Design a protein around this ligand. Structure first.
Ligand SMILES: [Mg+2]
Ligand SMILES: [Mg+2]
Ligand SMILES: [Mg+2]
Ligand SMILES: [Mg+2]
Ligand SMILES: [Mg+2]
Ligand SMILES: [Mg+2]
Ligand SMILES: [Mg+2]
Ligand SMILES: [Mg+2]
Ligand SMILES: [Mg+2]
Ligand SMILES: [Mg+2]
Ligand SMILES: [Mg+2]
Ligand SMILES: [Mg+2]
Ligand SMILES: [Mg+2]
Ligand SMILES: [Mg+2]
Ligand SMILES: [Mg+2]
Ligand SMILES: [Mg+2]
Ligand SMILES: [Mg+2]
Ligand SMILES: [Mg+2]
Ligand SMILES: [Mg+2]
Ligand SMILES: [Mg+2]
Ligand SMILES: [Mg+2]
Ligand SMILES: [Mg+2]
Ligand SMILES: [Mg+2]
Ligand SMILES: [Mg+2]
Ligand SMILES: [Mg+2]
Ligand SMILES: [Mg+2]
Ligand SMILES: [Mg+2]
Lengths: 52, 116, 137, 112, 150
RNA sequence: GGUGAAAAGAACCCCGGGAGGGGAGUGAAAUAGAGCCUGAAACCGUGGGCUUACAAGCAGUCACGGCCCCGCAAGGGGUUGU
RNA sequence: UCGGGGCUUAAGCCCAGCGCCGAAGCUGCGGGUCUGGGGGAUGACCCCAGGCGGUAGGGGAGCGUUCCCGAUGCCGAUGAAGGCCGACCCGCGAGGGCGGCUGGAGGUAAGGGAAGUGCGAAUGCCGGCAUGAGUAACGAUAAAGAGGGUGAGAAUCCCUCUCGC
RNA sequence: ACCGGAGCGCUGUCUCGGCGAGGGACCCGGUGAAAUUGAACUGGCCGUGAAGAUGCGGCCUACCCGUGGCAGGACGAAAAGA
RNA sequence: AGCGGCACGCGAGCUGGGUUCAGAACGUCGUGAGACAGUUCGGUCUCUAUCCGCCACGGGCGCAGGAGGCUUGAGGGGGGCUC
C-alpha cells in the first residue's frame, strides 16, 4: 500500500517465465538389500528393517 | 417498449476480435485489439503506397548494378533510352539483366550508340 | 513478379590496400561487401562477396589525420570515455582502423553484422591461404 | 484404451498440486508410485490417491493390466474458490481466496 | 425506494463520486427518460374521416367486390345457415369479408366464422375496410352509410 | 428464480476415511446428474503444428524465403526468419 | 560526433554545363461517388467532363436491437431463438445470406408504424476473473524434549516423564 | 516532566568502529493477503520533441531466466493541491 | 584548507533545528474580528521494490565430437597525495 508499488500488471508471459526454475525435481531412491523396495540413500525403511 | 442491449454488442466485439486474431497478449484478446487495428489499418494504407516505392528502387539497384557491369551509370543508361525513344524497358522489366542477359546487353549497345 | 534468387556460392575477393585512401577504399569494400554490385541484388537474403584485405598499415590518409583523427571507446564506468589518436591504432592493432571504417558503412541491421564477418583484414600481406583470391583494385 | 480418474472439490491450491502432477506425467505406474511415496509435498497425497484409483478403474473396468500401464496424461484444473474475510489494520477488510483443485489422471496401455 | 443519503464524502475517499443510489448510473437506480403514461390519440379533421371512408368503399367497389345484399335466409343465429347462404352468395371463404349489417342475428352467423368479421352499420372504418378482401353490406346499412356520405 | 415429458434422483461392483470418481442402470438426451436448460468473455490448464537463447521495442504493417496443413492445378490458411 | 563512417587537385566553398534519383503533386489503365451536360413513346440506362483531406457545425442517405398491424397467415422436431467456426456469396459500410457444429421451442418476409434503440473510456454502477506472488504475514522471545496410546492420517488429541512461565 | 546559559561527574553522542546474544530477514514443509496495474518485446549517451525520453534521430553497448541486496529514474504510490 | 554542475545532487536513504497548519505570548497595525521577508515557546516524516539502473550469486543453452587439468589477455577496473 505504501511506497513499494507495482507500476504495471505483469504480462502473463513475463509471469510464467519467472516460474522457470520453479519446477520441482523428482526424489532419489535405490533398491534395498531386503525387499526390492526403493529406499532413499543412507537410510532405513518401514516394512523392510535394517542391520547393525 | 424496452430494448435490451441484447446480442448486438457481443457480435460487434467478437467480429472485431477475430480480425485482430494473431497479435500479442491482451492486444488480441480485448478492445485493445481495436486500438491496434487502427494502427494496422493506417499502416496497411501507408505501406501500400510504400510498396510501389520499395520496388521502384528495388529494380533500380538491379538495373544500375547491371549496366555498371557493362560499364556505364544508371543515369547514363536511362538517358540513352529516353533519347533513343524506347519506353520499352520499363524499369520493372529491366530485370532482363538476369533473364536473357544478351537481350539486356543489346539494350545497352543501343544506349551506347543512341547517345553519340 | 520480380526475380526471386536462390542459394549462391560465396565469391571471395583479394583486395590490396597500399597507398589506398582510407575512405575511398572502404567504400568499395562495403558496396562489394553486400551483393549490391551484382545485378542479382536482394537486400533480404544478403549474399555479399567475401572480401579479404591485406597491407592494412599501408593505408594513406590526407593531411592532419594521423595526429588529428580520434577514436572513442566508452565503458559503462564513469570517466571511461577513453579516446585514442590514429597513430596509436597503427601501433597496436592497425587492422582496426579499416574495420571500424567498413563497419561504419555497413547497415545497422543484424544481417549487416553478418556481413562484417564476410570482411577479413590483415597486414603482411599473406592471407589464410584458402582457395579463392580474385585480385582487384 | 485409457482409464480416467478425477478428484473434484479438493481443498488445495492448483499451482501447488501442478508441481506434483508435472513430476509423474508420462511415467510408468510403479515408477510414479514411488515418486509420490517419498516426495516432500502436500499435493503428493491427493495426486497419489487419485492416481491409485486410476489404476483400479483401469483394471476392474477396462481390462487393462497393472503391470503394463502408465500415465498417458494428467493435469489439475482450477475449481471454484472459497472467499473469506480478513481483519486488517485500521479496519481494512481483505478477502482471502482458499482455492480448490480438480486433479485428473488418465492411465493407458503401454505397447506391444 | 432508495434513500437519499450521500454514500461517500467525495473527498480523500479514493472512491469514485456519487450522491444517492437513485442515480441512473447505478444498476437498480432510477430510469433516465423512461416512458411515462400518455395519450397517443388526437383529433383528425372530420373532412378526412369521411373522405377515407368513401374512398375505401369506392376502392373495394371499383375492384368489383362491394356487393349490396338484402336476402338473408339466415333466420337465426346459426352458422350453418350463413355458411349455406354465403355459399350460394358466391362466398366460398377464399376471401376475407367485412359483413356490415344492422341485424344482430346475421352477426351471430359470421360472428364465430373466422374468414369473416361482423360489423354494425356505423362501425364503418377504413381500417376494417382495407383490412378485408371482400365487402358485403346490407342495403339498409348502405343507406346509413349514405347518410354519412353519399 | 429454471433438472426432465415423468424422479424414473443412478440399486449393485470397484478405488477411497470421506469427498469425488470409474462401471452398470434410467432417459430421446447425463459435457440434462442435482443451485443440474441455453453456457458467450475475461481468467487457469493439458496435447499438437510453427517459432525463439548476437538481441533494441506502441509489438504492428509491406516484401521475399523456409517449415506445417487443406487442393487435380494455379491458389488459399497458420507460423516467423530477414 | 558534421545525423554517423568518413572526406583534402574533395565527399569542402564559389562559377558554368549536361544526365539521373526522388511525394500520396502530374500522366497512364481500372473502379466509386456526387454535380453539370447529351441520347431518350422509351421510365430506364449508356456516354462525356469536373469536384471528392477535414474538428467544432449544418445537411443527406442507410444498417441494426425492442414492440404493434401484416397474423384464425407463413417458417419450425426433416430442429426456432441464442451459442461456437468459415478462406465462401452479397453490400463502399453499418450489415445481410449460405455451410458445418451446438441447442431443444420458439420465430415473425415484403410493405408501414412506435421507441427505455447501438458504449471503450465518466477515480462510471453491479458481478466475475487477473497482477503483485507462492511473495509479506501467521498476532507478544514464558520453552520446549521424549516414550506410550488412539487413529485412514498425529510436531498440534489423550496419558506418563523431564523442562520452562 | 516549562524555555535558555555554564560547570562537575559518567558514558559508543562522537574520533570510529569492533565483537557477541536473542526476535525477524535467508533455505524447506503448511496456510496465504495488499496497495498498484492502458498494453509491453521496458539499455546507456548526445541531440530531440508542449521545454527533464526505455518508446522519435544518430551513435555506443548488450546471450536467455532468475535469487539475494541498494534505492537513482520510471516527473514512482497514496490524497480530482491544503 | 579552491570555486562550481549535478531539480542550489541526494527525505520511496536519514534528520526536521529552520521555513510552511491548528495552541500561546510580546512588540505592532486595526473600533473590531484579525494581521506581520517582525520576534518567541510547542507541534504526527508513511514495515513489503513490479520495471530500468547498480552492487553480489546462481540456472539454461551456445562455443559444429565428448572430457579433465593448466593458461593467453582484446577489453575493463583499482591505485595516483604529501610533509
Ligand atoms: Mg494485522
Ligand atoms: Mg428503502
Ligand atoms: Mg427519494
Ligand atoms: Mg428499479
Ligand atoms: Mg370473429
Ligand atoms: Mg442438455
Ligand atoms: Mg504465408
Ligand atoms: Mg437526416
Ligand atoms: Mg486509484
Ligand atoms: Mg517481492
Ligand atoms: Mg517471510
Ligand atoms: Mg501412522
Ligand atoms: Mg559538584
Ligand atoms: Mg486479489
Ligand atoms: Mg528483462
Ligand atoms: Mg533511441
Ligand atoms: Mg524465495
Ligand atoms: Mg561537490
Ligand atoms: Mg536540496
Ligand atoms: Mg522522510
Ligand atoms: Mg529554535
Ligand atoms: Mg526579513
Ligand atoms: Mg520555534
Ligand atoms: Mg514555530
Ligand atoms: Mg534488464
Ligand atoms: Mg588494456
Ligand atoms: Mg564487455
Amino acid at each position: 500500500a505504501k511506497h513499494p508499488v507495482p507500476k504495471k500488471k505483469t504480462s502473463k508471459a513475463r509471469r510464467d517465465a519467472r516460474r522457470s526454475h520453479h519446477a520441482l525435481t523428482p526424489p532419489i531412491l535405490v533398491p534395498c538389500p531386503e525387499c526390492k523396495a526403493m529406499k532413499p540413500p543412507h537410510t532405513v525403511c518401514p516394512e523392510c528393517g535394517y542391520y547393525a | 417498449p424496452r430494448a435490451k442491449t441484447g446480442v448486438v454488442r457481443r457480435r460487434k466485439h467478437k467480429k472485431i476480435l477475430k480480425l485482430a486474431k494473431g497479435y500479442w497478449g491482451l492486444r488480441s484478446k480485448s478492445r485493445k485489439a481495436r486500438e491496434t487495428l487502427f494502427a494496422a489499418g493506417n499502416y496497411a494504407y501507408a505501406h501500400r503506397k510504400r510498396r510501389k516505392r520499395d520496388f521502384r528502387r528495388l529494380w533500380i539497384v538491379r538495373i544500375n548494378a547491371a549496366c555498371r557491369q557493362h560499364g556505364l551509370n544508371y543515369s547514363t543508361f536511362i538517358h540513352g533510352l529516353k533519347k533513343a525513344g524506347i519506353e520499352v524497358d520499363r524499369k520493372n522489366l529491366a530485370d532482363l539483366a538476369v533473364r536473357e542477359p544478351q537481350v539486356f546487353a543489346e539494350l545497352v549497345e543501343r544506349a551506347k550508340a543512341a547517345q553519340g | 513478379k520480380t526475380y526471386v534468387p536462390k542459394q549462391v556460392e560465396p565469391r571471395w575477393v583479394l583486395i590490396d590496400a597500399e597507398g589506398k585512401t582510407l575512405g575511398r577504399l572502404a567504400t568499395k569494400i562495403a558496396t562489394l561487401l553486400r551483393g549490391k554490385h551484382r545485378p542479382d541484388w536482394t537486400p533480404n537474403v544478403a549474399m555479399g562477396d567475401f572480401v579479404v584485405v591485406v597491407n592494412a598499415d599501408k593505408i594513406r590518409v590526407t593531411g592532419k589525420k594521423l595526429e588529428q583523427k580520434i577514436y572513442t571507446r566508452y565503458s559503462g564506468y564513469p570517466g571511461g570515455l577513453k579516446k585514442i589518436p590514429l597513430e596509436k591504432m597503427l601501433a597496436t592493432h592497425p587492422e582496426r582502423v579499416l574495420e571500424h571504417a567498413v563497419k561504419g558503412m555497413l547497415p545497422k541491421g543484424p544481417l549487416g553484422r553478418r556481413l562484417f564477418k564476410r570482411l577479413k583484414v590483415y597486414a603482411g600481406p599473406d592471407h589464410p591461404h584458402q582457395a579463392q583470391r580474385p585480385e582487384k583494385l | 484404451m485409457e482409464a480416467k480418474a478425477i478428484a473434484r472439490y479438493v481443498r488445495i491450491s492448483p499451482r501447488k498440486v501442478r508441481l506434483v502432477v508435472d513430476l509423474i506425467r508420462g511415467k510408468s505406474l510403479e515408477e510414479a508410485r514411488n515418486i509420490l511415496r517419498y516426495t516432500n509435498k502436500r499435493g503428493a497425497y491427493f495426486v497419489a490417491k487419485v492416481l491409485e484409483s486410476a489404476a483400479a478403474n483401469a483394471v476392474n473396468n477396462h481390462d487393462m493390466l497393472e503391470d503394463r500401464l502408465y500415465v498417458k496424461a494428467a493435469y489439475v484444473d482450477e475449481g471454484p474458490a472459497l472467499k473469506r474475510v480478513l481483519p486488517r489494520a485500521r479496519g481494512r477488510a481483505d478477502i482471502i481466496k482458499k482455492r480448490t483443485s480438480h486433479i485428473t489422471v488418465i492411465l493407458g496401455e503401454k505397447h506391444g | 425506494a432508495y434513500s437519499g443519503r450521500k454514500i461517500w464524502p467525495q473527498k480523500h475517499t479514493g472512491r469514485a463520486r456519487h450522491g444517492d443510489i437513485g442515480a441512473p448510473i447505478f444498476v437498480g437506480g432510477g430510469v433516465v427518460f423512461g416512458p411515462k403514461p400518455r395519450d397517443y390519440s388526437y383529433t383528425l379533421p372530420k373532412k378526412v374521416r369521411k373522405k377515407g371512408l368513401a374512398m375505401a368503399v369506392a376502392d373495394r367497389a371499383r375492384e368489383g367486390k362491394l356487393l349490396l345484399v338484402e336476402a338473408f335466409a339466415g333466420v337465426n343465429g346459426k352458422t350453418k345457415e350463413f355458411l349455406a347462404w354465403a355459399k350460394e352468395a358466391g362466398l366460398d371463404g377464399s376471401e376475407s369479408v367485412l359483413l356490415v349489417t344492422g341485424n344482430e342475428l346475421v352477426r351471430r352467423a359470421a360472428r364465430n366464422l373466422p374468414w369473416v368479421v361482423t360489423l354494425a352499420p356505423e362501425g364503418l372504418n377504413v381500417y376494417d375496410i382495407v383490412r378485408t378482401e371482400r365487402l358485403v353490406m346490407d342495403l339498409d346499412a348502405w343507406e346509413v352509410f349514405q347518410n354519412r356520405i353519399g
